[PDB]
Amino acid sequence: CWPQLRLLLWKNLTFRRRQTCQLLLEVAWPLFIFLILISVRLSYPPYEQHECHFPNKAMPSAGTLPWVQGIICNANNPCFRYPTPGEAPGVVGNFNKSIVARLFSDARRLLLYSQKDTSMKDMRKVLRTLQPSKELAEATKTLLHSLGTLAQELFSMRSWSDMRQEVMFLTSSTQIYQAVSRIVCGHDNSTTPYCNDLMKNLESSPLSRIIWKALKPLLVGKILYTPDTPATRQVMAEVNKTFQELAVFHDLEGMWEELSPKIWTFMENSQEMDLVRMLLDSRDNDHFWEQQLDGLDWTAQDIVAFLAKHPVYTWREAFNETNQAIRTISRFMECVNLNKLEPIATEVWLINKSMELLDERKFWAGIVFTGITPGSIELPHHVKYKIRMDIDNVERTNKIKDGYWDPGPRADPFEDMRYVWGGFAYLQDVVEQAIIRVLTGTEKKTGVYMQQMPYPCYVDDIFLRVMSRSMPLFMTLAWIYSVAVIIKGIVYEKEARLKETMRIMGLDNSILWFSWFISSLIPLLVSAGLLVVILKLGNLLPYSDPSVVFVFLSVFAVVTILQCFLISTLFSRANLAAACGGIIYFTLYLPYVLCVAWRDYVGFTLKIFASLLSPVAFGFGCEYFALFEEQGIGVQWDNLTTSVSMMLFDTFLYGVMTWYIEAVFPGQYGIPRPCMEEEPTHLKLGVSIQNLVKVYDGLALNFYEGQITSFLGHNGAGKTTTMSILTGLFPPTSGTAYILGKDIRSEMSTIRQNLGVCPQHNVLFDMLTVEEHIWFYARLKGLSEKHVKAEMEQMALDVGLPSSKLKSKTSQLSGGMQRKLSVALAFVGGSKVVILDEPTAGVDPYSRRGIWELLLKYRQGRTIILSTHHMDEADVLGDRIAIISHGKLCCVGSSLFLKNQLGTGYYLTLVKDVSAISNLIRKHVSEARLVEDIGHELTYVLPYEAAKEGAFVELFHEIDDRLSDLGISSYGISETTLEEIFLKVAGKGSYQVKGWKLTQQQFVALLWKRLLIARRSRKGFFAQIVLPAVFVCIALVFSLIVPPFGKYPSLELQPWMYNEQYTFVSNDAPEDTGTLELLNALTKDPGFGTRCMEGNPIPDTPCQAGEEEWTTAPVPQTIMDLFQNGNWTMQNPSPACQCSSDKIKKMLPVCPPGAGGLPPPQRKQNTADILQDLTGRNISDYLVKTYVQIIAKSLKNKIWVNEFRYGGFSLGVSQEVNDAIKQMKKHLKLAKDSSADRFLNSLGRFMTGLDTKNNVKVWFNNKGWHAISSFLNVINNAILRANLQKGENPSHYGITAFNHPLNLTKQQLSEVALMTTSVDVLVSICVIFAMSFVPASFVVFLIQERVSKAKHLQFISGVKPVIYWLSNFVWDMCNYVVPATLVIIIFICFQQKSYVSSTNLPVLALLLLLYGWSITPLMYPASFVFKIPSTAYVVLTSVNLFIGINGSVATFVNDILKSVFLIFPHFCLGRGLIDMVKNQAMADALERFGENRFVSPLSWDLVGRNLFAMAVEGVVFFLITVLIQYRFGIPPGECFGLLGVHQNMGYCPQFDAITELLTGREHVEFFALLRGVPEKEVGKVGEWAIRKLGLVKYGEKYAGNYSGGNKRKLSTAMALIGGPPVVFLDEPTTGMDPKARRFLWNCALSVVKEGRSVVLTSHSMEECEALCTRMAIMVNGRFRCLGSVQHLKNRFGDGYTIVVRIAGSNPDLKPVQDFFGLAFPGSVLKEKHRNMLQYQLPSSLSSLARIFSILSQSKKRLHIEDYSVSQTTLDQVFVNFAKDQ
Ligand SMILES: *[C@@H]1O[C@H](CO)[C@@H](O[C@@H]2O[C@H](CO)[C@@H](O[C@@H]3O[C@H](CO[C@@H]4O[C@H](CO)[C@@H](O)[C@H](O)[C@@H]4O)[C@@H](O)[C@H](O[C@@H]4O[C@H](CO)[C@@H](O)[C@H](O)[C@@H]4O)[C@@H]3O)[C@H](O)[C@H]2NC(C)=O)[C@H](O)[C@H]1NC(C)=O
Ligand SMILES: *[C@@H]1O[C@H](CO)[C@@H](O[C@@H]2O[C@H](CO)[C@@H](O)[C@H](O)[C@H]2NC(C)=O)[C@H](O)[C@H]1NC(C)=O
Ligand SMILES: CC(C)CCC[C@@H](C)[C@H]1CC[C@H]2[C@@H]3CC=C4C[C@@H](O)CC[C@]4(C)[C@H]3CC[C@]12C
Ligand SMILES: CC(C)CCC[C@@H](C)[C@H]1CC[C@H]2[C@@H]3CC=C4C[C@@H](O)CC[C@]4(C)[C@H]3CC[C@]12C
Ligand SMILES: *[C@@H]1O[C@H](CO)[C@@H](O)[C@H](O)[C@H]1NC(C)=O
Ligand SMILES: *[C@@H]1O[C@H](CO)[C@@H](O)[C@H](O)[C@H]1NC(C)=O
């Protein structure tokens, strides 16, 4: 079994090598795919980012100055890469090095000191006393002390010394930025054009691009509120106070203008300044000043120089600088809108005013209070308010998350930070604080800070994940090509009956399947190894062992090969299977991507039950590979095992299914599973049949060695069954068959080793040479190398191709040479018993004679068993003819015995009065009669038993005597043929219709034929109507699940919008009662917010009742010992872990347990979430470590990891001045209703609104889109509930905030309407792909009818092919229209207002109609150049899909492009659909906004140009299709057969040309309707033709299910429908059966005898000599008689043939042979047998009387028993004419 496997492997490798066309592409396709993949990979490098923290943002309630400082400088999330000091639980600053803060603190200190200072009083007292004494010295000392204290207080500021330097340095790109960052924080018709171009150059400068967007809605915006309720009025007045807190710079200009002259005259010409300047320079005061100054700068000399009078830095310069600064800050503040408060009556007017202000580019958010009942009391204890703002300034409310998870803290300052720079959080906090202050009436000041949670050193490698999760597509493209190739190969080897021949030679299917598996696995394994190598080298899958991926790809190759072995058992056409394999593989892989989208509810059992396919298992393996690759550790030898096990189970299942289907459902050739002469005993016996039986008798026949015995039968008895049983593959019955002494049922393998079989089909492999065939067959026989070479040389010498030009050439020989080689190949191995099956089927007589010579040369003891339907072959070759019938043996014996036992007498033929010759013959012969009389031919019959006494000689002498009297020109005599013995043993309409009505009749006939072939196709090509239907159905059901992408509902800001989350509360500095009560109110019965309190005022979220436990999670002993080691302080409280080392890219840092440090006490807060106490713990490090470890643990299980925590809280701790200011205002220059009073009040308010007792940091995760506002509302509600007194039941006390964006403007609606292409193009492509399936049926029907089936056969008669094409187009439109209408109704069923509208439906309908009308003729010329059916479907579908994708990409993107792309109807339909949807969307947007537009879609600009374009395109395409086709002596009753005007000629093609879906009578009815037969008598003509050509019992049956004889009879019936004067036939009886060819011959004779000549061409000379009368051999062409029949047999024919048999036997008589040789001089020994001789006499036919005389005289002397004399045949004359060429 090993040499056979080696031979099969060699044959497969040689088949693969000799092509040199598929293997190089099989190698280059995956190479190109992976090169494109690595080229795309090299363009997207991985994005690495270090771990970093974010600063804390200050809200307006935490002070105006810190809020402004946080807004201005740190507004870009610098991600400082280190824990900022603001994240510490104690300090909430990070603005300690600010200069503005120091200046404000120094100003506050100076203001507080100026009240207690009384130096002015002492100076006035000294001035009054001076205007020496005792109290004068004490007064002077007190004045000096006060002056020294004032100087020490003034010189300790040092704030203006830096601000002045900064402002002079302000008046190179990074220098100004650094100066601003140092001065701020740490490290047109409406307004004047001044602020206009100020803002213009601010937007035009690359310095405030991140600051102007945040400062625009602060000083330009405007706030509106509804309704006009006194409670709303109070809360908005509080908001206005909060806003005007920073209005101190407004009333400063008036104060400066009022206090400038006073201070000027006080410093210029006042006595106080004079006394101060006089007391500064002296002899003893210098030491006092030097001591009081403590060595600081600006000594007394500088003091006198600065405070001098009439003057380098004098106080006048500082005065002018202060004046200029006040002037410029007033000019800046002049256009700062601080009156942003507008009350509106109702909501719709508020929205209208909001849109109007948005059109004016000055509009901030608007508050809408719900449930107020205008006219009410202070508050209803539950305030509900919504904040409406522009969609470009707030986060979207349609979704709360990004969808698919990805690393990254989402900290973009502009794209995902609209809640900060948009102004939502600030205004929300202000409104919440105002509501709290109005509800409680308290004076507490609690600040709120926004701290963002840091991220633990993430990297971005999304491309790697996408490539590793979408691997199967690129991994299986080239493999789909390869499996298509191998499927084509398998189906080609199966269809050519090669597997049946291998099984006949003694081979099992197991070894064939194994050889195919190996030959398909070798190149697949090579490709898998190369792909593994290129993946390891190209850094596409690094840190991965090549061995595991190599074995994975090997298992994938094995399972794909077994899938192909399963699929190949369902097809019978090589090209069709090759085209369908890739589609089947694609639709079998599609389940993987279908399941990967809905994997949220996919269980393990469902995955296992769905893992019966190979692509889904490969996808699961690739997902596991990606999961183990994204963490940098890779996959090595250590899920995947389950995937490999499922793939092996799939291989086993595919193998079992293949073994089952091959047995139960085989092809059209397999078997499905649930007158006796004396036997010559002088030779050897090879086969012995004894009582063979079957399923519905007795067979006793013996075959001898040195004889070529025949086996005849009607193919209906037990002849073919017995021949098959003798060859094996069939279980025998209760009988015996001893082949060379071996029983069939006993041993079958020993018999097949020496048994040659030659079936009807020639067995020759393609791409192979004849010497390779000989070698392969000889090696499969079982011979050694020397015997193989000897047999090859002998066969090359015997066949007749001893030349290197034919031995090394492929199967390019003629049919005769191929048949001769196939016959000779059955004699390899020295087989002692051979069984032939119909040799020389359709070869010319020369190749027939050659094969006969080869068979006679291979007769030396080989037991040749002939089996053919030809009688002349079995007569001239069969030595013992055996004819059986009815399953039993009827006759057996030699040719002479069978002809002389039950045959008829000789047949004489005279070729030129018929009564004189008949009377003479009846006078000479006893019982003679006339057989036939045809044109120049008279044939009679004579009894063979008569004329034995010597009457033959006298008759021949009488004929030769008066031969010139009669008109006979030549005479001949022959014997009885074997065909007669085998047969003995077993349309007109009375008038023509050709004319004007003939065209209409042909049109209606073609339409009727097409309707009949389309109606009877319920099982055939009927999917062309239901497949586009379901395609459009699924395309529409896919378009009803996509959101409109233009809706923003009212989203309630609550932290419970997510399923599960973790919270935390950190009580820092637990020594204050306020922080303790705030923590209590935050962790009391009401809970965090308004989730559950006296009910559930939030939809679809009920609260839990009982959950209260302060428990700690267990900890292993390892971490316990690690932390008992010690040295774990606040700084570095846990072992950190590195991330993204060199050459190792890690998505998240992995490190051993103990990263968090300790499990904090967790407790469920009765709100579907748990909180953990983090008091006294490092918040940032703990959060980072817990987040990274939780994400790692959740990703290690592959459970679609999502966010873990969202928010947490950290509580901590941070009038006299006002009183002093009031005293100063009253004490000095007191006034009222002036600018000074207002400025002092504003300054006092600003100084008061900057100190906060306690504060809370709200840690929020920016991954949640609405996480900051939710927890802000929560902490505001907690602050509200903490400020309640006397126990007001804080359960029903809460504040609810909403987020509802305003209505979209015109531009936004236009962009939303235009952004629908991403949905429209998919529907357009799906509709195009569904509608491009109808013309494919028409084009494949045209291809099927084009290959000599119906086109040329109808063109033979007058059919006017233009009318044929017109009828085809009409029927295609009528078929296309019904399906188009059905699709339109299906579309109409659904409610798609974009199409069902009264202005979109008829235009949609006519567009589809025109698309069909234009696409029908486009594919018409594609059927011309296609010499294969059932294959253009997939190619044309791929071309249409490519054109559709090209049009879609062109529409995606221009005028000239759209103008020239109109030639494609798919592009036209796509553009029409796109324009229709766009017009509908624009009209809907205009109706929604309040406009009116009635633009009809039928305008020539939008839609209507494409319609005319497609119409003219279809017209010119039909014209081009019509023009392409055009490319711009035989007397009556003479069968003049060529032995090499349209309506009056009949034609019969060689190959059968019938439709497989029509009946027998319908064919002749259609052909009569085409031949000008009236519709009235067309049925009578059809019935007449049916009765003439037989098959009456099969008149109503599909012609496709007929047999060869039935198809030939149908062709003959069609050939004589109209009754032409001359009918042309080509091979009428080919491969038929006796008793059936005689019927066609008699029909032809009856046709020709009625005065209608026939012209028949064929290869069998027996049919020609039995039918034709004049062998018109047109060597020179045209018409030329070649001397009839008998004339040609007597003129150029050979001599006679005499077969003689001796009376004596055992074994023969040499004297008879000697006398026969001595009698005739030209006697040749044609065949010498035992008791049987035959001889040939050339050039001695004219003396036949003398030959008969000598035979009669020698019968008694030579002891002759039987004799026979016959003439030459027609095939002998043919080979004689062809041998001399
Ligand atoms: C919670 O836990 C985290 C870590 O788990 C703690 O964060 C640690 O403490 C500091 C955070 O404020 C970090 O100190 C910084 O370290 C930087 C690293 O630079 C190098 O440091 C190494 C020593 O590790 C030196 O040999 C090198 O020469 C480098 O200096 C320092 O650069 C940084 O110094 C600052 O530089 C800036 C700019 O020059 C100055 O303006 C500034 O004044 C300061 O000098 C600073 O020393 C520390 O690295 C960080 N991580 C670790 C592992 O310690 C938190 O502190 C914990 N929470 C609490 C409340 O303690
Ligand atoms: C809300 O505050 C604004 C300014 O903070 C107030 O507008 C001031 O008063 C009148 C307009 O009512 C103007 O003459 C002033 O110039 C405005 N600005 C300043 C700085 O005084 C407004 O009156 C306040 N409204 C309510 C209802 O309190
Ligand atoms: C608003 C009014 C009341 C402020 C009055 C205080 C002003 C006039 C005084 C107090 C402190 C003084 C400053 C003290 C220090 C210096 C640094 C020196 O190199 C230039 C002069 C300069 C800058 C002085 C300018 C004048 C000064 C700013
Ligand atoms: C006789 C042999 C040598 C030639 C056979 C032609 C083969 C190689 C060509 C002709 C038609 C081609 C197919 C046409 C359609 C498709 C569908 C597409 O989705 C995958 C490629 C696939 C499956 C092509 C594979 C290669 C193909 C089958
Ligand atoms: C900043 O912190 C320092 C301590 O390092 C402190 O002295 C200073 O007052 C702080 N600045 C503030 C709170 O503005
Ligand atoms: C805003 O949109 C809502 C949503 O339907 C609609 O009811 C309202 O009339 C619209 N208002 C304006 C001014 O367009």
Please identify, by atom number, the ligand 1 atom nearest to the C-alpha of residue 90.
60
- The rounded Å distance from CA 814 to ligand 4 centre is 30
Transcribe 1733-1780 into DSSP letters. EEEEETT--TTHHHHHHHHHHHHHHTTEEEEEEE---HHHHHHHHHHT
Q: How far is CA 1583 from the centre of its chain?
A: 54
Q: Is the CB of 935 under 6 A from ligand 1?
A: no
The rounded distance, in Å, linking the Cα atoms of 1400 and 1627 is 61
Full strand arrangement of the beta sheet holding 833-836:
755-758, 833-836, 864-865
The residue whose CA is least distant from atom 33 of ligand 1 is 82
Interhelix angle 1578-1588/1560-1570, rounded to 10 degrees, is 130
Strand, coil or helix: what is 1013? helix
List the residue whose alpha carbon is closest to atom 9 of ligand 3: 154
> Beta partners for 455?
52
Paired strand residues for 575: none
**Is the C-beta atom of 53 inside 6 A of ligand 2?**
no
Using omega within 30 degrees of 0 as the cis cutoff, is the peptide bond preceding 227 cis?
yes
Question: Ligand 1 within 6 A of 1181 CB?
Answer: yes
With the most atoms of ligand 5 within 8 angstroms of its CB, the residue from 94, 96, 97 to mutate is: 96
Q: Which residue has the tokens 């699709």?
A: 1383
Whole-angstrom distance, CA of residue 1648 vs CA of residue 1639: 14
Q: Whose CA is nearest to atom 11 of ligand 4?
A: 579
Technique employed here was cryo-EM
Please give the single-letter amino acid code of residue 1354.
Q
Residue (of 1475, 1455, 1341, 1333) closest to 1400 by Cα position: 1475
Between vectors from CA 413 to CA 408 and to CA 418, what angle results, nearest 5°?
105
Q: How far is the C-alpha of 1090 from the C-alpha of 1274, rounded, in Å? A: 8
Ligand 6 atom closest to the CA of 351, numbered from 1: 13
The CA 1119 to ligand 1 mean position distance, Å, reads 26
Task: Point out the ligand 2 atom lying closest to the alpha carbon of residue 244.
Answer: 5
For ligand 2, is residue 240 a contact (CB within 6 Å)?
Answer: yes
Cα distance from N-terminal residue to C-terminal residue, the chain: 50
Give the Å distance between the CA of 1273 and the centre of ligand 2. Answer: 29
Superfamily name and number for 685-893: P-loop containing nucleotide triphosphate hydrolases (3.40.50.300)
Ligand 4 probe mutation, 488, 571, 1436, most atoms within 8 A of CB:
488
Token output for 1596: 């109503």
Q: Is the CB of 814 under 6 A from ligand 1?
A: no
For helices 2-19 and 509-537, the axis angle rounded to 10 degrees is: 50
Looking at the chain, which residues constitute the CATH 3.30.70.250 domain(s)? Answer: 904-975
Ligand number nearest CA of 358 is 6
The answer to whether 990 and 1575 have CB atoms below 8 angstroms apart is no
- 1529-1665: CATH homologous superfamily? P-loop containing nucleotide triphosphate hydrolases (3.40.50.300)
Alpha helix ranges (H) inside 245-339: 252-268, 271-280, 285-292, 300-306, 315-333
Atom 10 of ligand 6, residue of closest alpha carbon: 1303
Q: How far, CA to CA in Å, does 687 sit from each of 640, 691, 706, 836, 1555?
A: 61, 13, 12, 15, 45
Q: Is the CB of 234 under 6 A from ligand 2?
A: no
What's the CATH number for 904-975?
3.30.70.250
Give 96 Cα–ligand 5 centroid separation in angstroms: 5
3-state SS class at 1110: coil
Ligand number nearest to the C-alpha of 238? 2
Rounded Cα gap, residues 1081 and 1232, in angstroms: 45
> 1186: CA distance to ligand 1 center in Å?
21
Instruction: Specify whether the CB–CB gap between 971 and 959 falls below 8 A.
Output: yes
- Ligand 5 atom closest to 101 (CA): 14
DSSP label of 1556: T
For a substitution probing ligand 1, which of 81, 82, 1178 has the most ligand atoms within 8 Å of its CB?
82
The closest ligand to the CA of 579 turns out to be 4
> How far is residue 1769 CA from its own chain's centroid?
67
Per-residue tokens: 869: 């339907």
Phi and psi at residue 689, in whole multiples of 5°? -100, 130
Ligand nearest to the CA of 97: 5
Task: For 863-964, list the strands marked E by DSSP.
Answer: 864-865, 881-885, 888-893, 907-911, 929-934, 937-941
How deeply is 1310 buried, as exposed, middle or buried, from its count of CB atoms within 10 A (0-12, 13-18, 19+)?
middle
Handedness of CA 367, 372, 374, 377 (dihedral sign): negative
| Distance in angstroms (rounded) separating the CA atoms of residues 1626 and 1676 | 20
Starting from the CA of residue 249, give the closest ligand. Answer: 2
Rounded CA separation 739/724 (Å): 14
Residue among 619, 621, 626 nearest 643 (CA): 621
Write the residue with the smallest CA distance to atom 4 of ligand 2.
Answer: 339
CA distance 1598 to 1614: 16
Q: What is the DSSP letter of 1544?
A: T
Ligand 3 centroid, distance to 288 Cα (angstroms): 22
Ligand 5, atom 10: nearest CA belongs to which residue?
A: 96
| Nearest atom (ligand 4) to Cα of 574 | 1
Q: In 1211-1221, which positions are buried (b, 16+ CB within 10 angstroms) versus exposed (e)?
A: bbbeeebeebb
Nearest Cα neighbor of 975 from 1778, 1683, 1777, 1734 is 1734
Q: 1050: part of which helix (H) or strand (E)?
A: none
Helix orientation angle between 424-440 and 1267-1282, rounded to the nearest 10 degrees: 20
Is the Cβ atom of 813 under 6 angstroms away from ligand 2?
no
Cα separation, 1433 vs 235, whole angstroms: 75
In angstroms, what is the span from residue 306 Cα to ligand 3's centroid? 9
Nearest CA to ligand 6 atom 2: 1303
What count of other Cβ atoms lies within 10 Å of the Cβ of residue 652? Answer: 11
Instruction: List, by residue range, all CATH 3.40.50.300 domains of the chain.
Output: 685-893, 1529-1665
Task: Identify the nearest ligand to the CA of 100 by its number.
Answer: 5
Protein residue with least CA distance to atom 9, ligand 1: 1131
Please name the residue whose Cα sits nearest to atom 11 of ligand 5.
96
CA 1265, 1266, 1272 angle in degrees (round to 5)?
Answer: 140
| 51 C-beta closer than 6 A to ligand 1 | no
984-1007 residues labelled b (16+ CB within 10 A) or e (exposed): eebbbbeeebeeeebbebbbebbe
User: Is the CB of 1308 inside a 6 Å radius of any atom of ligand 6?
Assistant: no
Residue 392: partners with Cβ closer than 8 Å, 6 or more residues away: 418
**CA of residue 244 to ligand 2 center, whole Å:** 8
Give the atom of ligand 1 at the shortest distance from the alpha carbon of 1131.
Answer: 61
Residue 101 in contact with ligand 5 by CB distance below 6 A? yes
Check: CB of residue 1275 under 8 Å from CB of residue 1065: no
Report the nearest-CA residue for atom 15 of ligand 2.
Answer: 339
794 lines ligand 5 (CB under 6 A): no
Ligand of minimum distance to the alpha carbon of 316: 3
Distance CA 1455, CA 1462 (A): 11
User: d(Cα 1128, Cα 1176) in Å, to the nearest integer?
Assistant: 13
Nearest residue (CA) to ligand 1, atom 56: 1131
Using alpha carbons, list the distances in angstroms from residue 230 to 169, 439, 440, 1295. Answer: 51, 13, 17, 18
**Could you count the other beta carbons within 10 Å of the beta carbon of residue 1753?**
13
Closest residue to atom 3 of ligand 2, CA basis = 339
Taking a C-beta distance cutoff of 8 angstroms, is the pair 775, 762 a contact? Answer: no
Q: Give the separation between CA 33 and CA 29, rounded to whole angstroms.
A: 6
CA 236 to ligand 2: nearest atom: 27
Task: Find out whether 1117 and 1321 touch, Cβ atoms under 8 Å.
Answer: no
Helix (H, G, I), strand (E, B) or coil at 682: coil
DSSP classification of residue 825: G
> Which residue, among 1624, 1607, 1615, has the nearest Cα to 1568 in the 3D structure?
1615
3-class DSSP assignment, residue 158: coil
Q: Please report, for residues 457, 916, 1184, 1197, the alpha-carbon distance to residue 627 in angstroms, rounded to integers and kept in the order given.
A: 18, 109, 22, 10
* Domain made up of 1685-1781: CATH architecture: 2-Layer Sandwich (3.30)
C-alpha 1306 – ligand 6 centre gap (Å): 13
Hey, how many other C-beta atoms are within 10 angstroms of the C-beta on 107? 14
Atom 6 of ligand 2, nearest CA residue: 339
Distance CA 1240, CA 419 (A): 35
- For the CA of 1489, the closest atom of ligand 6 is 14
H/E run at residue 739: strand 736-739
| 3-state class (DSSP) for residue 542 | coil
Q: What is the largest CA-CA distance in the chain?
A: 204
The residue whose C-alpha atom lies closest to atom 28 belonging to ligand 2 is 237
71: nearest Cα among 425, 366, 390, 434? 425
| Ligand 1 site-directed mutation target among 94, 1132, 1177, 1183, most atoms within 8 Å of CB | 1132
Contact between residue 1422 and residue 1521 where contact means Cβ atoms under 8 Å apart? no
Cis upstream peptide for 1707 (omega within 30°)? yes
Q: Coil, strand, or helix at residue 1230?
A: coil
